[PDB]
Paper text:
Guanosine triphosphate (GTP) cyclohydrolase I (GCH1) (EC:3.5.4.16) catalyzes the conversion of GTP to dihydroneopterin triphosphate (H2NTP). This reaction is the first and rate-limiting step involved in the de novo synthesis of tetrahydrobiopterin (BH4). The effects of GFRP on GCH1 occur via formation of heteromeric protein complexes between GCH1 and GFRP, which are dependent on the intracellular concentrations of the effector molecules phenylalanine or BH4. GCH1−GFRP complexes consist of one GCH1 decamer flanked by two pentameric GFRP complexes.
Structures of the inhibitory (EM_hGCH1-hGFRP+BH4) and the stimulatory (EM_hGCH1-hGFRP+Phe+active) hGCH1−hGFRP complexes were generated using single-particle cryo-EM. The stimulatory hGCH1−GRFP complex was formed in the presence of phenylalanine and 8-oxo-GTP, a tightly binding, substrate analog GCH1 inhibitor. The inhibitory and stimulatory protein complexes were reconstructed applying D5 symmetry, yielding maps with resolution of 2.9 and 3.0 Å, respectively, which allowed building of atomic models. The quality and resolution of the EM maps allowed for unambiguous identification of bound ligands. Secondly, the EM structures reveal a drastic difference between the inhibitory and stimulatory hGCH1−hGFRP complexes in the structure and flexibility of the surface-lining loop 115 to 130 (region A). F122 and its close periphery appears well ordered and in a distinct closed conformation in the active site ligand-bound state of the stimulatory complex, while it is not visible in the densities after reconstruction of the inhibitory complex. In the stimulatory complex, however, the loop is ordered and visible in the maps. F122 seems to act as a clasp, holding the loop in position by π-stacking against His143, localized at the opposite side of the active site cleft. Region B consisting of residues 213 to 222 is only weakly defined in the electron densities in all structures without an active site ligand bound (xtal_GCH1, EM_GCH1+hGFRP+allosteric, and xtal_GCH1+allosteric). It is well defined in the other structures (xtal_GCH1+active and EM_GCH1+hGFRP+Phe+active). One structure comprises the substrate-bound, allosterically stimulated form of the GCH1−GFRP complex, and the other comprises the allosterically inhibited, substrate-free form.
Residue numbers in the entry:
A (entry chain J), B (entry chain I), C (entry chain C), D (entry chain B), E (entry chain A), F (entry chain F), ...: 68 to 249
I (entry chain O), J (entry chain K), K (entry chain L): 1 to 83
Write the structure that this text describes.
Amino acid sequence: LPNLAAAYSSILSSLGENPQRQGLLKTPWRAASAMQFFTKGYQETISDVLNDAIFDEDHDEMVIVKDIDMFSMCEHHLVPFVGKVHIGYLPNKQVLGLSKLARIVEIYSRRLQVQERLTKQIAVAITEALRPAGVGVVVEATHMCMVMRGVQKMNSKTVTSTMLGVFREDPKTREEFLTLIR
Amino acid sequence: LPNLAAAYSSILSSLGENPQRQGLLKTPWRAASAMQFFTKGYQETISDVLNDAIFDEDHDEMVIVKDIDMFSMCEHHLVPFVGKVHIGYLPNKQVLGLSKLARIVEIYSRRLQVQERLTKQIAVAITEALRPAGVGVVVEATHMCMVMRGVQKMNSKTVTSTMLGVFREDPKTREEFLTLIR
Amino acid sequence: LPNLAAAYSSILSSLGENPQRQGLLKTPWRAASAMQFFTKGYQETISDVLNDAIFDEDHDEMVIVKDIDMFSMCEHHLVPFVGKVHIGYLPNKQVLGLSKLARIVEIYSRRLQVQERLTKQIAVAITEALRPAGVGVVVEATHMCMVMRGVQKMNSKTVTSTMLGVFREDPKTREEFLTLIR
Amino acid sequence: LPNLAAAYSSILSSLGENPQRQGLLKTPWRAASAMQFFTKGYQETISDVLNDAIFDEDHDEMVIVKDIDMFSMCEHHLVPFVGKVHIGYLPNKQVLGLSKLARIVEIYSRRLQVQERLTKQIAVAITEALRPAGVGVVVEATHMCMVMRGVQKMNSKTVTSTMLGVFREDPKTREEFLTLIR
Amino acid sequence: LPNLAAAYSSILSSLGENPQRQGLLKTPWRAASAMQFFTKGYQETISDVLNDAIFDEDHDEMVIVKDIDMFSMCEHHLVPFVGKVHIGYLPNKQVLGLSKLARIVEIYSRRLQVQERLTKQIAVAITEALRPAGVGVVVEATHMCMVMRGVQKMNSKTVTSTMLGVFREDPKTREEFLTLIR
Amino acid sequence: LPNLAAAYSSILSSLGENPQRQGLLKTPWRAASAMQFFTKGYQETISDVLNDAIFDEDHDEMVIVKDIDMFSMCEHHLVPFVGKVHIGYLPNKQVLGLSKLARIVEIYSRRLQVQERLTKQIAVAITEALRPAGVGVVVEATHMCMVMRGVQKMNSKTVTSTMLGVFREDPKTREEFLTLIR
Amino acid sequence: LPNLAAAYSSILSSLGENPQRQGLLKTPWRAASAMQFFTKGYQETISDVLNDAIFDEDHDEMVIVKDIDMFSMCEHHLVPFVGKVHIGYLPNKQVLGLSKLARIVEIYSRRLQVQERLTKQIAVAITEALRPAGVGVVVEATHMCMVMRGVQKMNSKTVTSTMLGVFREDPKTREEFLTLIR
Amino acid sequence: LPNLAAAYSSILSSLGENPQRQGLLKTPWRAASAMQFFTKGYQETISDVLNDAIFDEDHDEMVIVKDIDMFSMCEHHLVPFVGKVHIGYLPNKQVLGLSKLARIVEIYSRRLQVQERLTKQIAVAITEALRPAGVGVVVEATHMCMVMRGVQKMNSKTVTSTMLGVFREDPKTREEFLTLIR
Amino acid sequence: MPYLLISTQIRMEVGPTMVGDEQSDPELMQHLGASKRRALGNNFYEYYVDDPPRIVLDKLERRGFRVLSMTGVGQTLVWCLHK
Amino acid sequence: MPYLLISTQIRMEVGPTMVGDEQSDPELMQHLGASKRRALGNNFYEYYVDDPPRIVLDKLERRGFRVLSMTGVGQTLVWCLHK
Amino acid sequence: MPYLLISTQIRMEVGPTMVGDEQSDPELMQHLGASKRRALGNNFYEYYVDDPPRIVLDKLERRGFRVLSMTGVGQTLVWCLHK
Ligand SMILES: Nc1nc2c([nH]c(=O)n2[C@@H]2O[C@H](COP(=O)(O)OP(=O)(O)OP(=O)(O)O)[C@@H](O)[C@H]2O)c(=O)[nH]1
Ligand SMILES: Nc1nc2c([nH]c(=O)n2[C@@H]2O[C@H](COP(=O)(O)OP(=O)(O)OP(=O)(O)O)[C@@H](O)[C@H]2O)c(=O)[nH]1
Ligand SMILES: Nc1nc2c([nH]c(=O)n2[C@@H]2O[C@H](COP(=O)(O)OP(=O)(O)OP(=O)(O)O)[C@@H](O)[C@H]2O)c(=O)[nH]1
Ligand SMILES: Nc1nc2c([nH]c(=O)n2[C@@H]2O[C@H](COP(=O)(O)OP(=O)(O)OP(=O)(O)O)[C@@H](O)[C@H]2O)c(=O)[nH]1
Ligand SMILES: Nc1nc2c([nH]c(=O)n2[C@@H]2O[C@H](COP(=O)(O)OP(=O)(O)OP(=O)(O)O)[C@@H](O)[C@H]2O)c(=O)[nH]1
Ligand SMILES: Nc1nc2c([nH]c(=O)n2[C@@H]2O[C@H](COP(=O)(O)OP(=O)(O)OP(=O)(O)O)[C@@H](O)[C@H]2O)c(=O)[nH]1
Ligand SMILES: Nc1nc2c([nH]c(=O)n2[C@@H]2O[C@H](COP(=O)(O)OP(=O)(O)OP(=O)(O)O)[C@@H](O)[C@H]2O)c(=O)[nH]1
Ligand SMILES: Nc1nc2c([nH]c(=O)n2[C@@H]2O[C@H](COP(=O)(O)OP(=O)(O)OP(=O)(O)O)[C@@H](O)[C@H]2O)c(=O)[nH]1
Ligand SMILES: [Zn+2]
Ligand SMILES: [Zn+2]
Ligand SMILES: [Zn+2]
Ligand SMILES: [Zn+2]
Ligand SMILES: [Zn+2]
Ligand SMILES: [Zn+2]
Ligand SMILES: [Zn+2]
Ligand SMILES: [Zn+2]
């Protein structure tokens, strides 16, 4: 933290500001602690998070967890992008708890990411945890490095989508996931 | 009830409250009677509820009963989750009354439940009552043990979905159920 | 916590459950830690929370912070009620930070409350912190002890509203607050 | 720019990243040029921007320019906040062009700001340019330092509002501005 | 028309196009006839348009004609702006027909205009035609010289508003006009 | 520019205007610079724009970039048409950056276009840049040469749609693109 | 009816049709009976319609009957206009039945009308029936002689509004009527 | 026109009106000219309307023109019906202009029609003009001879739908047309 | 009848001016030139003059009335005259 | 003409001040420095001075008028002066 | 200057009180303890005292002013004082 606190201090001097006024006194020490909140996913691990919450039950039907809110930091411009994550899976005699599906996302979105890589890592982390019959992941997001700066398309919203297992092989299993999330 | 009335009395003393003030005098006896309303489904039975209301008629076409409101109690955190239940069936020369389809749900949702188990028990209870050609059940729900406490995703909403009979075998029978409920 | 963990153990035995099955093993120890999250507001204090974030500036115009989400526990039935909080104030040469207005609410909503008392305590806590010219508070909420149990009005939603200072004396100052929150 | 390009290079090393991989090679030089876009308002001046576009005409009736999009950088946490700006004025025999009202906002929002200060500076910049009979400014905004980090109220949205001239003195002139913007 | 047909021919050669290809053969003669449609309001006159349709009747209550669509050409950049016109009046023993209120607008919007001037000319043309007790005009519009080029605020929408007679003197007469148009 | 500045000067004299009044003095020099903004796409090239931003990654799943705003000039009547562009592609071990997909559109829409030709040129420009497995392009647009002049259908909105690669060969790949954009 | 049946027979011959084909055989006798349905209000009378349904009760508070559908025939072009009627009154110890308020409208709208005259006649017919303290009438309508033919504004919708009694004298009584109808 | 002007004069005398009052003086001569506007489609021809606007281009992908407004006259009751027309086609190396697709509709809707016949005639007129690979036509409409008179279903809205060519033979070509129009 | 009440609406530089009710003096309203009407929905009669209210106050002084007080209530301005 | 009516809008520390109608005294409005106008939509003429209303009350006392009463109606403040 | 106008806003038990405009008496505002300001957007100056308006009326009587009338217009209460 004191290396980051000095690292935003050279930014404030470089933009023509004055770090001595009342607004910018604690700004090196408050912004640097917010950059360790946005990249705190690196110290977390799948085994420590799931907490032995994988439940044994004969329910082999579809489970969809929609409207999960993510908040990530882009790694080209270091400017946030926010959005919603839609996850669905077919459990194979082992159901995962509904909070741990949303706590997996907190591990991989709280990093420096790229949305194509962010989509794939959630679906592989759910596959290695449960061994289910199929996983689907849809991530919608608005990139502030396209809205604020550069091209300035304030309405654009990129969607990415990963299907694994029998969401990829069976087309009647992917047409049900895309309907209930609506 | 007096064992539950003493059982919330030790909770109020344990949180640092004062049970002697005017707000918390009847709180052991009003909250304990509300915990027997939320788990009153155990004393109900399918045969006593259907009340000989199964009607004989040559109508072999689809019947969907949508927007049934359920209100259940989770059994990991003892904190409610609420939602909507969508039920559809294909009657095989025996039509069930539209109130008893919504009164079956009151039996199984008014228990300590898990949403994957709650979805499957309604569809099996309709199968054993009518012997129809197919049953479908879709349950949407918001878990207050994900919104209030823990991860705090206020917008998340898990959907589960059970298909039995020819809703599982025929794909053109499941694509009609998912369209009319919209 | 071990007194609460034994206190939900006598509830599970009293409803006709079996505490020995896999769903109800950690249920005394997970639900009791969620009852200390819902009533953790008692150990918090206004002075420790504001954190010297009261800023001096000549801006004497209206500041409204809308859609703050609260999640409280009723104290008659011990059953939650959730809603939105709308707060507006007229600063008198001292502006409060926008996070501390939403962190004041976390102190008073995370208690056993009654909505009429909950409305008044936020507005008095903002008055004693800033000494502003006027405070307004509007709280919308849905009571699960009216939706789930009892009368079963699933759509009802009680609104309460406290105005202090020149929101009470001046009628042209209250008609602006009620318009921008829409 | 090379001082900022070295200044984000010490941030990437401090978070546990590797600046040598393909994603983080041009990240010091692309993010530093985006921090000079977000604070480029300091080199702009009101006289250079208005460009002699103040038109003489006998129209003394109300002119409202709504839904102007701003995109600012907070100065406590260095994390963006975005929103909409609503500006209305009563011209006193001199009408300003509709683009220069939206190009004034680009001067003051593209700085390190605080929303109470940001509201007041637009209304004073319009007063000194035209000398009109009255100015009104309403700014809605969502603070990512309240949504992403800290309190995590994803729905909260602070509104501030400055009225000058006869929008402050006359109450029938402020009730028309608040109606047409809807 | 042949002077305009040669006048767009020098534009097409100046942008680096080729006027010889199949798309740009009739483009001088089709675009020039569309520039005489957009400015055909100059040859129209109020007396020739009203066509003796002013009806005598004892109805002294408010008449509002909302959602009239206008389509005008700006006169700084020669780029269109489109919108809606809301007109209301209090007839003084003479009612005007509802088509001629919308055919007055076609006279003044089909010119090279400025929106502040466009608002005032409709309200003065209705005053000189009927001599009513009061006229109100509200014009909403989106300027393509703010959306496409320049500042690029795609959502901005300027509103102007002229009140004459007892819409200006009486405040309870202007608060009814602003409510029924909603 | 001085040839265009004289070229709009002969238009203003031809419509019966007076170029000597205050509104129409800088109108030849401001409108001619706006006609070089609307046709500035001719001097841009695909290789200069992509800027070596094609990233190598094993993500072979669908990427959709929706709500891209275009603003084009028709080439029959020289009157604008505006709309939205929806682009989706299947990357074949090479992902393109999300800004360059929206900056390709700026090259081909900022020309004199016809919407059928405009749809095809974006999809061929993405094919030659990435060599992906499939490209899809949907363009919605409202033609002001159908709304303002001629037929005057103010609500009409033409949609065109180009599919290349395995969006054309596989029908289960086109039914997913058409669902996520909604 | 046989005079009308011959009267549409000369219209069909005058437009260049053939009255001998299968579509236009019963067209003189079906359209003429529909012109006596659209003008059947002339044979109805207020006393025969109210049917002694005026009830005596001490309720002196406001009664609003909204969304009454009317369907009238214009008398300049003989082309329909349709809309909604909003009626409110303050009963003075005599309440009228809610059906007879909507059956009064059927008397005066099923005539050849003009909307300014149509508004006033309902409010005078309610005044002479009840002698109440005040009557209000708001009529929205779309004129097909402005949408189909003539100016072709498909979105325009004229509103007229009559207030009598203490809706005219008291401004706090008219601001309540205009709010509950929304 | 003088034969129609006498033909509405016998209607006004037959309904019990007085043709001598001020409202009904020009009513024979204004309504008869509006009956020649509603049936002016008979003098128009496809060849005179298309105006050599069929453009040669290699674009063989789908073109949909939605929300075209029609306004027709029924031929059983001579009472209007209004609605929207959705047209889509697959061009076979010849693209038709987007205005002439909406000007074809004006030929066939401005007649005495029946909606089943009206749907088929547009699709055959587009087939004979372009020779395309397939045509689709969807027409929504509300019949005032079902809303005003007779059954009085104010919400009913008949949809008809014609598919020709490969919209009829290929089912994956009709499922795309029905999706983009939404 | 010593007391008398006149009022005027939206502006004071233009009429019409209310001058009395059902039980007013018939000779005094005849000297002022008043006309009588009942607006629709009202249960009472009223007298009015079309003169601006400054001209009516100059008539009523010659008859012997003196302005006690003036008020503004609503959008109406009321004068109270005593003889 | 003994009675006289002046008014002012939104604030009392600034003009303009209304001083009369169509039938007012032409010499008295000339001493006050009044100008005459008709706003659009109105059917009447009016006189106005650009002075604040305290300065007009000090002019009208030297001519012989005394303030009877003052009212506030709407957003307007009205003074009634009698000679 | 015989006439004088004071006003106060939302409540009458608290200040500040307006006491004059641009052309007021400089010695009289100095005895009242007035300060001068211009709010943003206004084109005029104004004097104010921070005392409640009952205390200002007890000062102005010792100088020789008598309250003619009082009005309430808007959310403002206006006193008119004559010497
Ligand atoms: N599938 C499913 N899972 C449920 C239901 N109700 C419920 O609480 N769960 C899960 O039960 C799990 C219990 O978690 P746990 O044993 O690790 O302990 P915990 O409460 O401290 O975890 P937490 O931090 O996520 O709240 C949670 O992860 C939650 O997702 C339900 O109806 N269905
Ligand atoms: N399928 C179908 N069932 C109907 C219709 N109308 C109607 O009341 N029913 C059913 O008729 C049944 C009659 O129930 P019942 O003989 O057990 O007696 P009940 O009224 O006391 O039952 P309740 O407590 O549900 O109202 C109800 O369960 C209701 O669902 C209908 O149109 N279709
Ligand atoms: N009025 C106002 N306050 C702001 C703006 N931006 C911004 O961060 N703030 C406030 O700045 C304050 C800084 O808080 P602080 O010094 O106590 O430290 P902190 O960041 O750790 O607090 P946190 O836990 O609430 O994030 C926050 O409470 C936040 O509300 C703004 O534009 N206007
Ligand atoms: N009030 C008003 N202003 C208008 C209208 N149309 C229109 O272009 N304007 C203004 O005309 C002004 C002309 O600006 P300018 O002389 O400085 O030159 P410019 O076009 O290069 O400025 P730009 O960069 O904002 O486009 C613009 O600022 C624009 O706001 C209109 O109808 N009403
Ligand atoms: N106030 C009012 N005007 C009406 C009604 N119905 C109706 O057609 N009108 C008016 O009647 C007028 C008759 O116009 P007109 O005598 O000049 O002849 P016109 O039909 O050829 O005019 P057009 O070109 O506008 O259709 C139209 O301007 C139209 O606005 C109605 O209910 N109320
Ligand atoms: N696929 C993908 N691309 C991203 C993400 N974030 C992000 O900035 N990009 C892309 O990163 C690219 C970096 O562009 P660049 O090296 O040419 O430099 P640049 O920032 O100056 O380009 P610009 O003008 O478009 O902002 C941008 O084109 C942007 O589309 C992301 O999460 N996914
Ligand atoms: N104010 C009021 N009127 C009511 C209520 N319920 C109800 O039926 N009415 C009125 O009761 C009246 C009874 O009408 P009526 O004695 O003339 O006979 P009716 O039913 O044949 O008349 P109808 O043709 O309108 O149905 C109706 O006009 C209806 O408006 C109610 O709750 N409030
Ligand atoms: N497919 C297509 N057609 C276009 C575009 N832009 C554009 O103006 N058109 C068509 O260009 C055609 C040119 O028509 P035309 O040569 O017969 O002459 P015109 O303008 O007088 O016809 P009009 O009366 O329909 O406006 C119009 O029918 C219009 O539909 C476009 O982007 N795509
Ligand atoms: Zn980025
Ligand atoms: Zn739980
Ligand atoms: Zn309760
Ligand atoms: Zn911040
Ligand atoms: Zn312009
Ligand atoms: Zn065109
Ligand atoms: Zn008509
Ligand atoms: Zn019909």
